[PDB]
Amino acid sequence: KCSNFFANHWKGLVVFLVPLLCLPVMLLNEGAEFRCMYLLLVMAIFWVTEALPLYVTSMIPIVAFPIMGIMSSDQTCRLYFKDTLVMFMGGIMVALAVEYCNLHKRLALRVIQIVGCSPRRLHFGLIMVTMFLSMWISNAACTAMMCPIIQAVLEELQAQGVCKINHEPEPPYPTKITLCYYLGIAYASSLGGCGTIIGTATNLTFKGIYEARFKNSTEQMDFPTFMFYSVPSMLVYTLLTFVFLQWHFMGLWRPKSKEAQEVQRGREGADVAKKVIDQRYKDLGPMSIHEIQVMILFIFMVVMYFTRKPGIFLGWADLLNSKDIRNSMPTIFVVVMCFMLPANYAFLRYCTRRGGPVPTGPTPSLITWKFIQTKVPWGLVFLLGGGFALAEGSKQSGMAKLIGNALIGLKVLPNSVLLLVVILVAVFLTAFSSNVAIANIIIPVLAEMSLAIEIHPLYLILPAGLACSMAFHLPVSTPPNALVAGYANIRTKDMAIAGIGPTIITIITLFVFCQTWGLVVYPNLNSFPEWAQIYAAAA
Amino acid sequence: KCSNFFANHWKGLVVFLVPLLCLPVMLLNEGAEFRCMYLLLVMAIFWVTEALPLYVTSMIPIVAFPIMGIMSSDQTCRLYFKDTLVMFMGGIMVALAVEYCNLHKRLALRVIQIVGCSPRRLHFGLIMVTMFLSMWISNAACTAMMCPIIQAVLEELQAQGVCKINHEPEDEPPYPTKITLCYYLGIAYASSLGGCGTIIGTATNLTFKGIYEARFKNSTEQMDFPTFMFYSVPSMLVYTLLTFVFLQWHFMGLWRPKSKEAQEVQRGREGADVAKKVIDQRYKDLGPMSIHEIQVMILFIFMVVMYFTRKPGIFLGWADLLNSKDIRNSMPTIFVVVMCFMLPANYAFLRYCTRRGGPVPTGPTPSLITWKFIQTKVPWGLVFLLGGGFALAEGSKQSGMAKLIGNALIGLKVLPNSVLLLVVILVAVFLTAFSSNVAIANIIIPVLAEMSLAIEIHPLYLILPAGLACSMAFHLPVSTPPNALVAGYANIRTKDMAIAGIGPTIITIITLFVFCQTWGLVVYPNLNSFPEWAQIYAAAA
Numbered sequence A: 001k002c003s004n005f006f007a008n009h010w011k012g013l014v015v016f017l018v019p020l021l022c023l024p025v026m027l028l029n030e031g032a033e034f035r036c037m038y039l040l041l042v043m044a045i046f047w048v049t050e051a052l053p054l055y056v057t058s059m060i061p062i063v064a065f066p067i068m069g070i071m072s073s074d075q076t077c078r079l080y081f082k083d084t085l086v087m088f089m090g091g092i093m094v095a096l097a098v099e100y101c102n103l104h105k106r107l108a109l110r111v112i113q114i115v116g117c118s119p120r121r122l123h124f125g126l127i128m129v130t131m132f133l134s135m136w137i138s139n140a141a142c143t144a145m146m147c148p149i150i151q152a153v154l155e156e157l158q159a160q161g162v163c164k165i166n167h168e169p170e171p172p173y174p175t176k177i178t179l180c181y182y183l184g185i186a187y188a189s190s191l192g193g194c195g196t197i198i199g200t201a202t203n204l205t206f207k208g209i210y211e212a213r214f215k216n217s218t219e220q221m222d223f224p225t226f227m228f229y230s231v232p233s234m235l236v237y238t239l240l241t242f243v244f245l246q247w248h249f250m251g252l253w254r255p256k257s258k259e260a261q262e263v264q265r266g267r268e269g270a271d272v273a274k275k276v277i278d279q280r281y282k283d284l285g286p287m288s289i290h291e292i293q294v295m296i297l298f299i300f301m302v303v304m305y306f307t308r309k310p311g312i313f314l315g316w317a318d319l320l321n322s323k324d325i326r327n328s329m330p331t332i333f334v335v336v337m338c339f340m341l342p343a344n345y346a347f348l349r350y351c352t353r354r355g356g357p358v359p360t361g362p363t364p365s366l367i368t369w370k371f372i373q374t375k376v377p378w379g380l381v382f383l384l385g386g387g388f389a390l391a392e393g394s395k396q397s398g399m400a401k402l403i404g405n406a407l408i409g410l411k412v413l414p415n416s417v418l419l420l421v422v423i424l425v426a427v428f429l430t431a432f433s434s435n436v437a438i439a440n441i442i443i444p445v446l447a448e449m450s451l452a453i454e455i456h457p458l459y460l461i462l463p464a465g466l467a468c469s470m471a472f473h474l475p476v477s478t479p480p481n482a483l484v485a486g487y488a489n490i491r492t493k494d495m496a497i498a499g500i501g502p503t504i505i506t507i508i509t510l511f512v513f514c515q516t517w518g519l520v521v522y523p524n525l526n527s528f529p530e531w532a533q534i535y536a537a538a539a
Numbered sequence B: 001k002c003s004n005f006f007a008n009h010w011k012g013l014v015v016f017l018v019p020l021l022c023l024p025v026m027l028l029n030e031g032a033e034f035r036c037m038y039l040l041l042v043m044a045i046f047w048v049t050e051a052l053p054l055y056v057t058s059m060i061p062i063v064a065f066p067i068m069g070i071m072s073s074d075q076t077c078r079l080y081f082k083d084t085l086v087m088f089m090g091g092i093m094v095a096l097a098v099e100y101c102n103l104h105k106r107l108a109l110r111v112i113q114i115v116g117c118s119p120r121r122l123h124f125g126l127i128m129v130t131m132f133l134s135m136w137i138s139n140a141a142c143t144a145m146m147c148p149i150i151q152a153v154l155e156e157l158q159a160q161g162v163c164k165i166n167h168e169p170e171d172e173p174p175y176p177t178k179i180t181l182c183y184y185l186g187i188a189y190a191s192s193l194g195g196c197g198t199i200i201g202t203a204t205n206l207t208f209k210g211i212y213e214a215r216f217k218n219s220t221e222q223m224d225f226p227t228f229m230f231y232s233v234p235s236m237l238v239y240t241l242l243t244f245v246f247l248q249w250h251f252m253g254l255w256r257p258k259s260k261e262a263q264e265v266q267r268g269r270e271g272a273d274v275a276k277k278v279i280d281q282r283y284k285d286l287g288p289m290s291i292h293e294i295q296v297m298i299l300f301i302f303m304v305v306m307y308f309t310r311k312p313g314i315f316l317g318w319a320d321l322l323n324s325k326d327i328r329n330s331m332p333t334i335f336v337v338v339m340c341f342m343l344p345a346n347y348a349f350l351r352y353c354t355r356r357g358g359p360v361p362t363g364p365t366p367s368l369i370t371w372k373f374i375q376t377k378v379p380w381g382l383v384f385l386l387g388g389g390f391a392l393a394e395g396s397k398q399s400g401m402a403k404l405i406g407n408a409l410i411g412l413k414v415l416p417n418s419v420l421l422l423v424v425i426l427v428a429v430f431l432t433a434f435s436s437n438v439a440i441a442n443i444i445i446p447v448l449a450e451m452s453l454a455i456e457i458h459p460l461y462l463i464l465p466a467g468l469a470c471s472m473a474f475h476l477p478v479s480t481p482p483n484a485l486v487a488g489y490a491n492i493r494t495k496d497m498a499i500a501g502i503g504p505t506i507i508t509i510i511t512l513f514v515f516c517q518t519w520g521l522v523v524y525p526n527l528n529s530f531p532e533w534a535q536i537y538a539a540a541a
C-alpha cells in the first residue's frame, strides 16, 4: 500500500517539497548572492532528478531574475538565442538537408563496400562510419540512421542459417553477436560526438560558458583549433573500444573459445551472403544532381569554417573588418541557398535545348519548410539559453566569489591528481543524468575554483567538458543507450558489464593526451597566464 | 519560350533577377543608408511576391548586416528573440492548454447559446467582443486568446452542415474557405482597430504621447486618459461597423441575393430553430466542469488580470512596487506556462491518506499539458519572422536610413492645410505596411512637430491623425503581429489578405480625415487657431 505511493508519485513530492525546504538559505542571509544560490540549488535538483521536463525547467530564470534584483526582463531574454546557438540551429538544419535526399546511406554503403566482407571487417566498417557521421549529426539521429542496415544483414544471415539472432527459449534474450554490433554502434555514436563543436550540444555549452566568462583569453576554442585538439584522441580510443568489444564477445585472442568458432563459421560461406545483401541494398540509383549540389554546399560551409581567421594568410573576416562576422554568416547562408536553388535543371529545354519532355510545373527546391518544422528539437533553445543565463546571473550576483573563496582548500593537491578526480567526478555524475545538465552544473564551479587556485582554467575545463559525454553503463545515461536497448531487448546487467571497457579506456586516454599533446596544441597550459592573474586580482 | 515557361517558373525568375535589377540603387550612391535601402527593397519584393517562404526571407538580415558593415553578428542575432517575442510565444502556449482541456468547446457552446446560432449575428458579436476586450490589452494577446474560440465555433457550425471549413484537395496545407477567411481576418482587423481606443490599448499611443509631451511642455492642451478616450471612441465605433459591413459583402453575399454564399447563409437562417435544440442538448451532453478545466481557467484569469494591472496609469500597479529592475509582461506568461506543468490534472493521489472510499490512482498523475503537444502545434517560424521585424527596425535606425526618410518629408510644406493632412495620413499608412508601428511613429512624429511649428498651425492638428494612422496595417503578414498570428494559425495566403485589406484602408482613411476636422473641434476648441505657447516656441526656434 503506502510503499508504492512513493513509487508512483515521488516526482510530485520532489516538486512540492524542495522549494520549501530550501527557504532557510534565502531567509537566514541577506545578500543577493544567497537568492541566486537558492535558485541554483532548486534548478540543479530539478535537472538531475528530471521532476520536470528539462526544457520547462530551463525557463525558470526568466521569471526568477527580474522578481529578484539580479537582472531586468529584457537582458534575460536576450541572453537566450545568442550567436553560437544560431550556428548550432543552422547546423541542425543543414544536417537535415543532407538526410533528405539520402546522402548518408550512399556514403555508408560505399565505405562498407570498400572495407572487407568478413564479420570483423564489417564491424570495423560500421564503427568507423558511425563515428565519422556522428561528427556532424546528433547522436540519436546517427544511431537511428545506422541500425536498419545491421538489422537487415542479421535478418538475412539468420534466414540462410549462418547464425542465430536470439537464444532459444519475456522477450527473447539476444545473442553475443547482436549485442556486439548494436553496442558498438551505440558506443561509436557517443565517441564520435566529441570530435567537433557541432557534433553534440555539450561542446557548445562548455565552449559558450568559457567564452562568456573570460572574454580577454588569448587561447581560443574556435572551430579549427578545437578539432585539432580533439581528433587524435577520438581516433585512439575509438580504435581501442573496437578491440575490447571483439575480445569480449567474439573471442579475438582465444582460438579454443566457442565465440571464435562462430566467427569462423561466419567467415566461410556468409561473406558472399552479406555482400549480396549490401550490393542489392545499394539500389539507390546513379548519383543525382540534387545530391551533388547538397554535397558541394556542405563542403563549402566547412571550408568557410577553416578560412575565417588562420594565421598563415589573412582570409576573410579580416578583409571584412568593419564588424565581427563570427561563423553565423556561412551557416545561414547555406540554409537560405538551399531554398533558392532548384533540383532538376530540366527547364533549360525551353531555352534552345532539345532534351526531352518539359516540366509540368514548378521545380522543387533542395528542401521544404515542413520537413524542417517537424524534425528539429526546438526545446534545445530553452535548454542551452537557460544554461547561459544561469551562468551569467551567477557571475553578476556575486555567488562566484563566494564559492571560489569557499573551495580554496584544495590547493594542497598536485595538479595531476586534481585532474584525475575532476574526470572521475564528471564521469560518475553523468552516469545518471543528461550530459547538458551536468555540464551546466559543473563548468562554472570549475571556472571559479580554477581562479581561486593558481591554475590555468582551460587545463581543467576542457578535459572535464569532454568527459561529460562518456556514458556507457545505464540506459538512462544517454539517449542512444535507450534506443539500442529498445531495439534489441538488451538487459541492463549486460550493458553495465560491457561498459567497463570504454570507461577505463577513455579515462586513461584523456588523462595521458591532455597532459602530453594538448601542450603541443596549447603551449601555455602549465603556467598561470597574465590575464588570469588580472581576473583573480579583480575577484 | 512558350507562355508556360512564365506560367510555371516565374518565381525562379524573380529570385534570380530582382537582386541584379535593384543593384544600381547601391552602385550609384555612396553611403551605408543606400545599402540598407537596397536590402529593404529586395526583401519587400520577396515578401509581396512570396517567391520564398516568409520564414526563410526573414533570415536574410543575419547574413546581410555583418557583410554590409551595418552592425555586428552578435548584435544582430540578439535583436531577434527580444522580450516581446517571448511574450508572444508564451501566449501561443497558454492558448494550446485551453485547447487541450476542451475548455474552448464549452465557451463556444455558451456563446452560441447566448447569441442564437446564425453566421452574421455571431460574426458581429465576436467582432464587437474582440474590439471591447482589446481596448485594454495588447493586440497580440487578444488574437492569441480568441483563435481557439473561433476554431470551435466554426467546428460547431460545420457539424450541422451549414458550411465547410476547408476546400477538398502534398505539403501545401488546405486552402481555407470564404467564411473561415471572414472570421479570422475579422478578429485580426478587430484587434488592430480596437487597439486605437485608449492610451493603454497599444504601445504606439504611449510612444507618440510621450514624444509630444517631451517636446512641448507648457502646453495648454492635454492628452490624459479621459480626454483621449473622449476624442477617439466615436471614430473607432465607425471604423468597426463599416469594416464589418465590407467583410460581409466581400466574403458572404450581403447586397447580392444571387450570390451562392448568400443562399448558404439563407438556408442556415431557416433551420436555426431546430439547431437551437441540438445545441442546448449538446451542451448538456458535456458534464460539469472538471478540476482540470477549473485550474486552467483560474490561471488564465490570473494572467489577464496581471496584464491589465501593470502600470495602468490610473493607479499604482505592481510594476512600481518592484522597481529594482524593469519587469515586463513576459514574467506572468512564463509563470503560467511553468505552473501548467507543475500542477496535477486530477487530485486522486490524496485518496491514499484519509480517503478510504476513493480508489488508488495506480499510475503517475498527468499534468495540465505535455511537452510533445507543444512541440507539434506551435508554429516556430514566427520566431524568425517577428525577430526579423525587430532587427530590421533597429538596423534602419543605426544605418541612417531613418533620418533620410524623415528628411524626405520636409518638402511637403508647400501644400495647403487640408491637402497636407491627407498626404500625411497617406504617407503614414504606406510606410507602416513594411515595418513595426513604433519605428514608424519614431521616424515621422518629430518631423511633423517641427514642420507644424514652422508652418504656423496647432501641432496636435497634424500629430493626432498621423499617430492614429500609424496603427492602420491590413495588407501583409509582416505589417503587424496579429496578421502574422492569424496567417500561422489558419493557413492564409498573402494574396487573399492583400486583396481583402483594401476595404479597411479606405474606410479608416476617409473616416479619420472627416472626424478629425469635425469632432476634434468640439473636443479641442482652439485646434483651428494657432495658440500663444506655440508662438513662444516658434519664436524660440
Ligand SMILES: CCCCCCCCCCCCCCCCCCCC(=O)O[C@H](COC(=O)CCCCCCCCCCCCCC)COP(=O)(O)OCCN
Residues within 6 Å of the ligand: A008, A009, A010, A011, A012, A013, A015, A016, A019, A020, B341, B342, B343, B344, B345, B349, B363, B364, B365, B366, B367, B368
Ligand atoms: C519572501 C517570499 C518567499 C516566497 C517563497 C515561495 C516558495 C514557493 C515557490 C512556488 C512553489 C509552488 C509549488 C506549487 C505546485 C505544487 C505541485 C504539487 C504536485 C503534487 O501534488 O504531486 C503529487 C503528490 O503531492 C503530494 O503528495 C504533496 C501534497 C500536494 C497537495 C496539493 C499541492 C498543490 C495545492 C495548490 C497549490 C497552489 C499554489 C499557488 C502558488 C503527485 O503528482 P504526480 O507525481 O502524479 O504528477 C506531478 C506532475 N503532474
Ligand SMILES: CCCCCCCCCCCCCCCCCCCC(=O)O[C@H](COC(=O)CCCCCCCCCCCCCC)COP(=O)(O)OCCN
Residues within 6 Å of the ligand: A339, A340, A341, A342, A347, A361, A362, A363, A364, A365, B008, B009, B010, B011, B012, B013, B015, B016, B019, B020
Ligand atoms: C559589390 C556588389 C555586390 C553585388 C552582389 C549581388 C548578389 C546577387 C546574387 C544573385 C544570385 C543568387 C540568388 C539566385 C540563385 C539562383 C536561383 C536560380 C533560380 C532558378 O533557376 O529558377 C528557375 C528559372 O531560372 C532562370 O530562368 C534563371 C536562369 C538560370 C539560373 C541558374 C542558376 C543556377 C546556376 C548558377 C548558380 C550561381 C550560384 C552563385 C552563388 C525556375 O525555378 P522554379 O521556379 O521552377 O523552382 C524554384 C524552386 N526554388
